[PDB]
């Protein structure tokens, strides 16, 4: 993550991120709504950071330092560039909505009143088709990636040294290869929880309540479609095992 965004999302909540004099100007219900929207954007910033660790630290490091067989890095990190493009674009839209909402003269005081429309756009049309296609592929290659990682770590000395070297810093404690893969897989199922709680505190404006209700429905449709398009790929599985599924 870049320093500007890390600092903007350093506080545990929206109520602790904004100036206390600004916080005192809002009703209790607005603070509760803003705290949950802040959690969505903060967790999205962290999710994009997890994808940057996978693409830049892991994937690119193995290409530039190791002599792995062709197709090995792609097997370890399936669809990482596509996942990074989907979420970096979504994070850019969320951060632009926050920035436009800042008070003049402030880099921290803002209120987001219209999140619903942004969530409808992300979870519909071509962007939803791309999210569905990408996660159906990624989640179906999860077991194969984990199994290829384990074999490499146990049999390749230079691979083991590379992993131990790049994961040694304390800031990578939660982000080894398998941990990044599971953080990404679980990201999509966090959206309904966050959206329902934002909706709970967004009844003040009826158009906003309606938009978040539509967004929640679209996110659930996407998850059901992804869940239905998953079948774990297995290295060396014979056709007979597959057509007898």
């Amino acid at each position: 993550s870049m320093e500007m965004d890390e600092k903007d999302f350093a506080a545990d909540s929206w109520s602790l991120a904004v100036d206390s004099s600004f916080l005192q100007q809002h009703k209790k219900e607005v603070m509760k709504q803003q705290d949950v929207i802040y959690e969505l954007i903060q967790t999205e910033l962290h999710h994009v950071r997890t994808l940057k660790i996978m693409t830049r630290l892991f994937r690119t490091g193995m290409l530039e330092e190791l002599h792995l067989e062709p197709g090995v890095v792609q097997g370890l990190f399936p669809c990482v560039d596509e996942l990074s493009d989907i979420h970096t674009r979504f994070l850019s839209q969320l951060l632009e909505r926050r920035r436009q909402a800042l008070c003049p003269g402030s880099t921290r005081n803002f209120v987001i009143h219209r999140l619903g429309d942004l969530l409808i756009s992300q979870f519909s049309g071509p962007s939803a088709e791309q999210m569905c296609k990408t996660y159906s592929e990624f989640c179906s290659r999860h077991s194969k990636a984990l199994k290829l990682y384990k074999e490499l770590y146990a049999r390749d000395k230079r691979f083991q040294q590379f992993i131990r070297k790049v994961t040694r810093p304390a800031v990578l404690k939660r982000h080894g290869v398998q941990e990044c893969i599971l953080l990404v897989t679980q990201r999509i199922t966090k959206y309904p929880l966050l959206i329902s709680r934002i909706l709970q505190h967004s009844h003040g404006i009826e158009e906003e309540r309606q938009d978040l209700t539509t967004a929640l429905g679209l996110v659930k449709e996407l998850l059901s479609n992804v869940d239905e398009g998953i079948y774990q790929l297995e290295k060396g599985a014979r056709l007979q095992e597959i057509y007898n599924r």
């Binding site: 705290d35 959690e39 404690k173 953080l183 679980q186």
Partner: protein, 179 residues
């Protein structure tokens, strides 16, 4: 320091997300209670052994039967959660969660955890459950369910007061380290 993986399973109302948050912060959040939990690696020392225990939540995966098992690979210990204020969450343990955990995590120890133990003697909880002809889960009912499902052990805790929380994770670490 050896690395071990823990996954918590159970119904949404069981309070699994709150339990992971309270343990990882060693505090019930005073300003804001997070909606979600990403992951955490806790440094635990139990019976003189140092372990890095990775923590994972399954909240949000309950309705997705093909996404949910992706959380299970290489799990060393399972926390199977129910809420003491919800006999319905306890009934779903032998029917749904136990067969699933035994299939995807064979031979992995399961600790049955009764959450929200502070609500066992809460008058509002007793009045609300009495409308559906129910009452808070009794300690012996929890022990018997744990015995029946072949759990490694039975424990109770309250994420609200923090009582029993540390003990649950230190015992999970002990279970994860066994043969």
């Amino acid at each position: 320091a050896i690395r071990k993986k823990l996954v918590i399973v159970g119904d949404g109302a069981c309070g699994k997300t709150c339990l992971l948050i309270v343990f990882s912060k060693d505090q019930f959040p005073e300003v804001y209670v997070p909606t979600v939990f990403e992951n955490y690696v806790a440094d635990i020392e139990v019976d003189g052994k140092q372990v890095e225990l990775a923590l994972w939540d399954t909240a949000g995966q309950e309705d997705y039967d093909r996404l949910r098992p992706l959380s299970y690979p290489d799990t060393d210990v399972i926390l199977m959660c129910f809420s003491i204020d919800s006999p319905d969450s306890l009934e779903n343990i032998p029917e749904k969660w136990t067969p699933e955990v035994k299939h995807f995590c064979p031979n992995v120890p399961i600790i049955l955890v009764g959450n929200k133990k502070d609500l066992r003697n809460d008058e509002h909880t007793r009045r609300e459950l009495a409308k559906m002809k129910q009452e808070p889960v009794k300690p012996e009912e929890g022990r018997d369910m744990a015995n029946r499902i072949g759990a490694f052990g039975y424990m109770e805790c309250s994420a609200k007061t923090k009582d029993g929380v540390r003990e649950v994770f230190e015992m999970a670490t002990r279970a994860a380290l066994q043969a």
